[PDB]
DNA sequence: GTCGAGTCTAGAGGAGCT
DNA sequence: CGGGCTCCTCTAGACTCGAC
């Protein structure tokens, strides 16, 4: 079963091609084939035969439609039909007015006509509009919620708001969540409301789905980050009248209009306490009802627009599948948090010890006014403040004498205890110490007071001055208009001590071995430091950008090379920078990760598979984290999650980097998923191919993309990486930047950043050679620009339109880069939607026990039972094949190359990580996952291994 | 100026100049600590006791004799204990023969008490009692700070802080790693240079796994702490008999506990911290500095100022803060010399109770870290000192 | 019996052949278990603050457990002999009858010796501590350490005060120390009449007092006082007297040395007998366990978390706490109360369901046997206050 | 009437993901 | 003309209100 292209590219095997495209395809146009040959041989690419990859023989499930497009339409309609019915039931429903009074009872209360309140276990209907309020003072347990049904209002009150007990359990369970159980729940952030639903944390997948009005708003009238900034600042410019921000008030104004919404000025659910919520119960319930009603009106105004602008049901089904993400955790999650926090505290304590010692040594410069001669600390606040106001041995004394001397001493001490009257009610904050030292010390009244300058950190503008950082023998100086830099002495036009700068530079040059004498970035004369020039530090993004802290991770090579040095010398500077590099991720993500809403299931809620499995431990915890995903958070309709889509991968020098490795499947369950290989690059190629001659590999770019293998390291990313001598993970950035609009300057800067051996001229030559290339990538760019400049920019595969704020009529020539990148990125999102729909179809038809775990822009992880891991692998490979075939069909190409027909390898692992073989060595996990947490290495399997293990069948 | 000379003149050390050499200090053959050094060692032992017994689950105290039962070991170098009266009785009075003198000397090496070299044997003797105390619920531990004798022939004495941890064999390696990390963090906590404290896995003559902590002294690294993953052989040697009296309850099954020995040298640790701390200022940790408050006086009226200083002393002492009464010193010295003296003595605070205190109560408080002078009311001094000491912990 | 109760409750430790009246006073075995060690540490802390912190010009001293060793007679203390040296002589080359006599002579003449009293160690540090006080007499040196006396070898933990005082006020200082030590012993005693002072004369005719404790078998000299004079200091510092004389007024005087030698081990025995339903009413400044935390109902996890927080707070506040909630098999409330009373536990705290509702916990006092409900946040302050009031 | 301390917000540079 | 996001800490600026 071997097939070949007119351009000799190995296409699909006969067995798979007959079942996908079918026989009777029209013969290729001879003129088109000759044109493709002429274009392909022009760049010296014609010839060079590729080794025939082994053929594949699989009996795919019947495609019960007419072709690929009809099959996917039918699948998506079947998947998202009942949810559309629930949505339609809301639009045509008349609701009784908001009840005058809100019940104080615990549980769910159903408001009938005329405000009567009735106790009900759970809401009865299937369609709801939901808003959940949480008292942030008492953690993450929900406080109250108001729901709208097609026939009645609903309100929910927790036991913590009513009973008022002294202490509540700090670990959450399904018992103290919001019960809501083919069901649809609408809301502005359904994910936040979903995270508080009791039935959502069960391993068994409840068929409830969530439609988000903010995601629909991004799909319909969304804005980019620049567009959002401009719109907020102003709160062609006609896009402002058709678009709004993600806030519910702005969305309600845009779609429904009418009186503006008002938020509670008190903000008791965020800043207040539980007692305040008890006192202001009715007011908060009314505000929640207002939010729910506004959400309902927004949904009414948004659903028809979203259906019209995204006519393909695959988009809606993919959004519904992206709204049910689920991440399992165990008791090791708590250990991960503790250990990461302990390591962070230890490293921060070491760094603060060094910084505090340096600061304390600096405080001795007040004597003799010696701080004015320090090259670093001359500009600080060294001012002081006055304190504000309104013989022979006598022998052993006898017992009475001792008593008298003790009582007289006490009385004298206690008499003055009442002279406190002469002092201000507000205690001064360290008047004796200098001002810069005062700013670094907490006030004695603070509940978190620590001795010394405990507030010091590497991110402060005084820390580089304390460590006496020198760049090529030049002290670092901060300019508010230009960021960090350094002072080069020798210029001859509290005062800056340029004499000290000259002395330090002379000492450094005579010691290390150095000799208009410096070029660097550029002498900015606006700073006007007497006797010194201000040169900005080199930034990784160009000379225009400013450096905010010389302790960035990009200055570690400059620290090692000796250009950047610390004043105390030794390893102090390198240690500080290495601690900063190991703690930056945790410093920025510890609140997010630690405050993740983890609901620990009891043993009864766990299924029999988890408990019966040998790996089950009766002394361990079992729970789940539901990531709060916005299914369409970008103009490209990508998912958005503040933490899990920003979760750093395991690194040898990053505390807490094992975050995803801590997402561990429960016993009896395994995580099966795969990553699409060269996804958007291949989408761009197949677009360019369908625009030139209507066959795979017709363009040179498509020919380069198709020919190669990832295992052998000869794919286009690997080829570019070998050409420029950088890692493939950086060749990804290079190629994607070139595809998405990066110029030669970006290429040069990226090469110099990633290849320290290259000079400016070598990087420039490499960039110009790879960009000069009537080029290889001309057809792709032409098709992308043609789609973008059309009056109705739509996705080439599913037809989903661009946001109304990005149509060419509204915006004429503005933000064109975003609108041309939208084609490829929304094509990738359509790829994800098709993958989700096909995976759900395969899981449903063949009864594979599993559910959607998480997706990050190219990945599709599934919590599959261990008994069905290889069936899931085969299903995922089939879905990849079908998605590529769907792209080819919708672009007009009636064939599929074999190279891109399957995943390189499907990862079957007990935890989420980039690679199967990784043991996740980390400062917080120094022994690895196998030694500390007992997670073995799984299996990464190609198509042939899966076929061998499953006999090429999805049924058992 | 050398650290040893400064610590000797400030009474952290003791001994003649022939005893202040590196070899003499490391040997442990002489008392090497003055009153300030003894207080510093007491503070270090108190911190060790806190962190290893008070805040650790299932750790209990134990005291064992400096003398161990005599054993006819092949090559043990432990010094033996003999009765001088018996030696005189054999030598003098009735006259024995050449063979009899051989028999007596053999009996000395056979049946005579020997000075302890490690605290492991003492801890293993009280294993059954601590089993009874915990209802045989593993894991537990026995901690003890005492003096152990090392042959050098001179006899050297070293203060040893040892925790014998009885853990099941399943989690021995995990508990050993936990103890290694905990001890390294404990040593680095009070250290101005945590990098100078390190670790290095090592093995013994019998191939048992282990690790040793080190402190980079100016001459070289020294093993200030050892952690051995000992087996069940020591328990069986100390308890030859029924296994039912040795087994502990690990979860649901009885297991002979694996023994981990965490032996640290408090004397060598004090020396390490004296080197770590070292204008001439010993930046010792606030939780280890021997003297935490120093008091002075003004320029009259002397009687009332003294009365106030006595009251403030008593107030500070009753709260548990060591105080140096520098006012009672009849020798006059300038405040600069007094402050330098307090710096070299690792005095955290120096209080100046002047005549102006009698008016309002404002006493000049100077901190060792910043050398800056801050005014505070007398009633607030005790609370500030308590807060500072509880926050530095 | 008291000894059996102390043994079962880990105040004592030893075989029944070691927990006898003669064996306990001997010191040839480790007679203190964990609770006994904690009680002895409390006694040492009370002695130390009352003599070295609350006193003027009293300083710490640490000395070796070995003495230089001399051929002088009347020294029954066990000597140090190198094991390798004895093996080398007996094996390898064969000595003669005379040679082995010389070897035994060398051991008596030159070898280490175990200290009998802490007096010599303090006297060796006389010059350094005199320089610490700028030669200004008077001053005192204190030390708590184990001393070795022939019985086998017995070990007694001694708290000795060596007070250097001018010859003029020797009797006044001696009486001052006598009354202060008598008050210190009687401070913690439920029966302060059991402590007595008797004038005693040294074998050289020097006067002093021997503080006894009226044990059920008879008085034992828990503490002994002596006006040793300048003889010992002159013996330990032969040569020039300039380094011996201290500055007292305008005169330079060799200070008379006062010995105040206690027995912390015998003092611990005395206080165990004084403290003795079966309850050991130890003084709050001496009781090893001061708080006992227990749980009373379900849920176990939440109550255990509350108890963990309370235990952490109390430990951070310096209060010794017995984690009784961690016991897998817990006895009845009456059995726990009896066990705590036998173990000299000041207070018993029980955390129940009501604690989760309002924070009120059942607090029990050992001395009165009266239950009380107190708020959680007010337990730590109550305990700290109670300890401060008992101290003063 | 005025100075200084919360307090709240906005902007800039850095850093995680894809 | 790399793009689509997310959040953080630090710092400057404006606003508010109590104590002298
Ligand atoms: N700096 C980046 C990184 C990623 N992407 C987009 C393009 C990719 O198609 C998609 C996934 O990123 P990957 O790093 O996974 O790129 P590949 O899919 O090519 O990698 P692999 O072949 O290893 O799956 O995200 C991008 O535009 N810019
Ligand atoms: Ca990819």
Descriptive report:
The complex is a heterotrimer, with one copy of chain A (956 residues) and two copies of chain B. Helix content of chain A is 40%, strand content 9%. Chain A is an alpha+beta fold. Chain A has 32 helices and 21 strands. In chain A, helix 22 crosses helix 23, helix 25 runs antiparallel to helix 26 and helix 26 packs across helix 27. The radius of gyration of chain A is 33 Å and the shape is globular. By secondary structure, chain B is of the alpha+beta class. Chain B has two domains: 226 residues, Bira Bifunctional Protein, Domain 2 (BirA Bifunctional Protein, domain 2, 2-Layer Sandwich), CATH 3.30.930; 100 residues, 3-Layer(aba) Sandwich (Rossmann fold), CATH 3.40.50. Helix content of chain B is 38%, strand content 24%. Chain B has a seven-stranded mixed β-sheet with strand order 1-5-6-12-9-8-7, sandwiched between helices. Chain B has a five-stranded mixed β-sheet with strand order 14-13-15-16-17. In chain B, strands 2-4 form a two-stranded antiparallel sheet. In chain B, helix 3 packs across helix 10. The longest helix of chain B has 20 residues. Chain B is globular. At the B-C interface, helix 3, strand 1, strand 3, helix 4 and helix 5 of B face helix 3, strand 3, helix 4, helix 5 and strand 4 of C. The structure holds a DNA duplex (18 and 20 nucleotides). Chain B: InterPro entries: aa-tRNA-synth_II/BPL/LPL (IPR045864), Anticodon-bd (IPR004154), Anticodon-bd_dom_sf (IPR036621), Gly-tRNA_synthase/POLG2 (IPR027031), GlyRS-like_core (IPR033731), POLG2_C (IPR042064). Chain B: Pfam families: HGTP_anticodon. Chain B: GO terms for molecular function: DNA polymerase binding; DNA polymerase processivity factor activity; DNA-directed DNA polymerase activity; double-stranded DNA binding; identical protein binding.
Key phrases:
heterotrimer; A: 956 residues; Nucleotidyltransferase, domain 5; 7-stranded mixed β-sheet; 5-stranded antiparallel β-sheet; 32 helices; 21 strands; B: alpha+beta; BirA Bifunctional Protein, domain 2; 5-stranded mixed β-sheet; 14 helices; 38% helix; globular; binds 2'-deoxycytidine-5'-triphosphate; binds calcium ion; DNA-binding; transferase; Mitochondrial DNA polymerase; pentameric
């Amino acid at each position: 079963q071997l097939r070949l292209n007119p351009l000799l590219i190995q296409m699909l095997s006969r067995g798979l091609h007959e079942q996908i495209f079918g026989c009777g395809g029209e013969m290729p146009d001879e003129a088109a084939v000759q044109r493709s040959v002429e274009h392909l041989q022009k760049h010296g690419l014609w010839g060079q035969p590729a080794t025939p990859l082994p053929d594949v023989e699989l009996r795919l499930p019947r495609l019960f439609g007419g072709n690929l497009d009809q099959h996917f339409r039918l699948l998506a309609q079947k998947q998202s039909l009942p949810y559309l019915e629930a949505a339609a039931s809301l639009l045509e429903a008349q609701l009784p007015p908001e009840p005058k009074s809100w019940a104080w009872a615990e549980g769910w209360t159903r408001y009938g006509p005329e405000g009567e309140a009735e106790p009900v276990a759970i809401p009865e209907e299937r369609a709801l509009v939901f808003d959940v309020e949480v008292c942030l003072a008492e953690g993450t347990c929900p406080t109250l919620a108001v729901a709208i049904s097609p026939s009645a209002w609903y309100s929910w009150c927790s036991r913590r708001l009513v009973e008022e007990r002294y202490s509540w359990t700090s670990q959450l369970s399904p018992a103290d969540l919001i019960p809501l159980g083919e069901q649809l729940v609408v809301g502005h952030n359904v994910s936040f409301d979903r995270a508080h639903i009791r039935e959502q944390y069960l391993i068994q997948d409840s068929r409830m789905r969530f439609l988000d009005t903010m995601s629909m708003h991004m799909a319909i009238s969304g804005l980019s980050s620049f567009q959002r900034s401009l719109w907020m600042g102003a709160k062609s410019w006609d896009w402002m009248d058709i678009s709004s921000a993600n806030n519910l008030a702005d969305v309600h104004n845009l779609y429904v209009g009418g009186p503006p919404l008002e938020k509670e000025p008190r903000e008791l659910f965020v800043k207040g306490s539980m007692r305040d919520i008890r006192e202001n119960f009715q007011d908060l319930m009314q505000y929640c009802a207002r939010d729910v009603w506004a959400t309902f009106e927004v949904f009414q105004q948004q659903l028809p627009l979203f259906l019209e602008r995204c006519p393909h049901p695959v988009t809606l089904a993919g959004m519904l599948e992206m709204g049910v993400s689920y991440l399992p955790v165990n008791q090791n999650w708590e250990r991960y948090l503790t250990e990461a926090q302990n390591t962070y505290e230890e490293l921060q304590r070491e760094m603060k010890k060094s910084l505090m010692d340096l600061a304390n040594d600096a405080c001795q410069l007040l004597s003799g006014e010696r701080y004015k001669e320090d090259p670093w600390l001359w500009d600080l606040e060294w001012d002081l403040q006055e304190f504000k106001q309104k013989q022979e041995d006598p022998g052993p004394p006898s017992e009475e004498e001792e008593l008298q001397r003790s009582v007289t001493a006490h009385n004298r001490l206690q008499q003055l205890r009442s002279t406190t009257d002469l002092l201000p009610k507000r205690p001064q904050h360290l008047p004796g110490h200098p001002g810069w030292y005062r700013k670094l010390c907490p006030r004695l009244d603070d509940p978190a007071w620590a001795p010394g300058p405990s507030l010091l950190s590497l991110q402060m503008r005084v820390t580089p001055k304390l460590m006496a950082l020198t760049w090529d023998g030049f002290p670092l100086h901060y300019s508010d208009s230009h960021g960090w830099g350094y002072l080069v002495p020798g210029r001859r036009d509290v005062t800056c001590p340029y004499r000290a700068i000259e002395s330090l530079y002379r000492k450094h040059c005579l010691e290390q071995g150095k000799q208009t004498y410096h070029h660097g970035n550029g002498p900015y004369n606006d700073v006007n430091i007497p006797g010194c020039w201000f040169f900005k530090l080199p930034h990784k993004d160009g000379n225009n950008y400013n450096v905010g802290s010389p302790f960035a991770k990009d200055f570690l090579p400059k620290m090692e090379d000796g250009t950047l040095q610390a004043g105390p010398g030794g390893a102090s500077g390198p240690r500080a920078l290495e601690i900063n590099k190991m703690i930056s991720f945790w410093r920025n993500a510890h609140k997010r990760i630690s405050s993740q809403m983890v609901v620990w299931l009891p043993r009864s809620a766990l299924p029999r598979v988890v408990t019966r499995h040998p790996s089950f431990d009766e002394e361990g915890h079992y729970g789940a984290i539901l990531p709060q995903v916005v299914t369409a958070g970008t103009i490209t309709r990508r998912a958005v999650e503040p933490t899990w889509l920003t979760a750093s991968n395991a690194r040898p020098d990053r505390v807490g980097s094992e975050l995803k490795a801590m997402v561990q499947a429960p016993p009896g369950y395994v995580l099966v998923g795969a990553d699409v290989d060269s996804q958007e690059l291949w989408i761009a190629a197949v677009l360019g191919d369908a625009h030139f001659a209507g066959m795979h590999g017709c363009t040179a770019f498509g020919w380069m993309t198709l020919q190669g293998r990832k295992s052998r390291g000869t794919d286009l990313h690997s080829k570019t990486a070998a050409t420029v001598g950088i890692s493939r993970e950086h060749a990804k950035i290079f190629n994607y930047g070139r595809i998405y609009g990066a110029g030669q300057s970006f290429a040069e800067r990226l090469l110099m950043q990633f290849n320290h051996r290259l000079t400016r001229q070598e990087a420039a030559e490499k960039a110009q050679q790879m960009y000069a290339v009537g080029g290889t990538e001309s057809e792709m760019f032409n098709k992308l620009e043609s789609i973008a400049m059309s009056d109705t920019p739509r996705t080439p595969v599913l037809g989903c339109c661009i946001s109304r704020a990005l149509e060419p009529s509204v915006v004429q020539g503005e933000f064109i880069t975003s609108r041309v990148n939208w084609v490829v990125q929304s094509s990738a999102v359509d790829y994800l939607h098709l993958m989700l729909v096909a995976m759900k179809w395969l899981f449903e038809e063949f009864a594979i026990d599993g559910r959607f775990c998480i997706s990050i822009h190219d990945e599709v992880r599934y919590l599959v039972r261990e008994e069905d891991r290889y069936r899931a692998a085969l299903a995922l490979q089939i879905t990849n094949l079908l998605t590529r075939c769907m792209f080819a069909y919708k672009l007009g190409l009636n064939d599929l190359p074999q190279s891109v027909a399957f995943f390189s390898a499907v990862d079957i692992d007990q935890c989420l990580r980039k690679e199967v073989t990784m043991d996740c060595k980390t400062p917080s996990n120094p022994t690895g996952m196998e030694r500390r947490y007992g997670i073995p290495q799984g299996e990464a399997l190609d198509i042939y291994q899966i076929i061998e293990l499953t006999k090429g069948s999805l049924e058992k | 100026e050398a650290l040893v000379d400064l610590c000797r003149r400030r009474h952290f050390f003791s001994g003649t100049p022939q005893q202040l050499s590196t070899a003499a200090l490391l040997s442990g053959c002489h008392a090497r600590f003055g009153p300030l050094g003894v207080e510093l060692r007491k503070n270090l032992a108190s911190q060790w006791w806190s962190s290893m017994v008070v805040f650790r689950e299932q750790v209990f105290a134990v005291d064992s004799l400096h003398q161990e039962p005599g054993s006819s070991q092949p090559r043990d170098s432990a010094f033996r204990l003999v009765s001088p009266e018996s030696i005189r009785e054999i030598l003098q009075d009735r006259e024995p023969s050449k063979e009899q003198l051989v028999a007596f000397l053999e009996n000395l090496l056979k049946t005579s008490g020997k000075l302890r070299a490690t605290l492991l044997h003492g801890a293993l003797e009280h294993y059954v009692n601590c089993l009874d105390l915990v209802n045989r619920k593993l894991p537990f531990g026995l901690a003890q700070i005492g003096v152990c004798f090392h042959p050098v022939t001179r006899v050297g004495e070293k203060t040893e802080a040892s925790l014998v941890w009885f853990t099941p064999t399943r989690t021995s390696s995990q508990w050993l790693d936990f103890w290694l990390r905990h001890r390294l963090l404990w040593w680095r906590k009070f250290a101005m240079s945590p990098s100078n404290f390190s670790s290095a896995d090592c093995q013994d003559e019998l191939g048992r796994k282990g690790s040793k902590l080190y402190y980079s002294f100016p001459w070289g690294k020294e093993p200030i702490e050892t952690l051995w993953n000992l087996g069940d052989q020591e328990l069986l040697h100390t308890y030859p008999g029924n296994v039912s009296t040795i087994q502990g309850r690990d979860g649901r099954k009885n297991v002979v506990p694996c023994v981990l020995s965490v032996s640290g040298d408090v004397d060598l640790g004090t020396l390490a911290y004296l080197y770590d701390s070292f204008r001439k200022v010993l930046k010792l940790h606030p939780c280890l500095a021997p003297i935490k408050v120093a008091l002075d006086v003004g320029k009259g009226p002397t009687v009332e100022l003294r009365q106030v200083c006595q009251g403030l002393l008593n107030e500070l002492l009753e709260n548990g803060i060591s105080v140096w009464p520098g006012y009672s010193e009849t020798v006059h010295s300038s405040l600069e010399q007094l402050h330098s003296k307090y710096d070299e003595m690792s005095v955290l605070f120096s209080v100046l109770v002047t005549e102006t205190t009698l008016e309002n109560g404002l006493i000049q408080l100077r901190s060792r870290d910043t050398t800056m002078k801050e005014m505070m009311h007398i009633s607030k001094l005790r609370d500030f000192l308590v807060k500072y000491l509880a926050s530095a912990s």
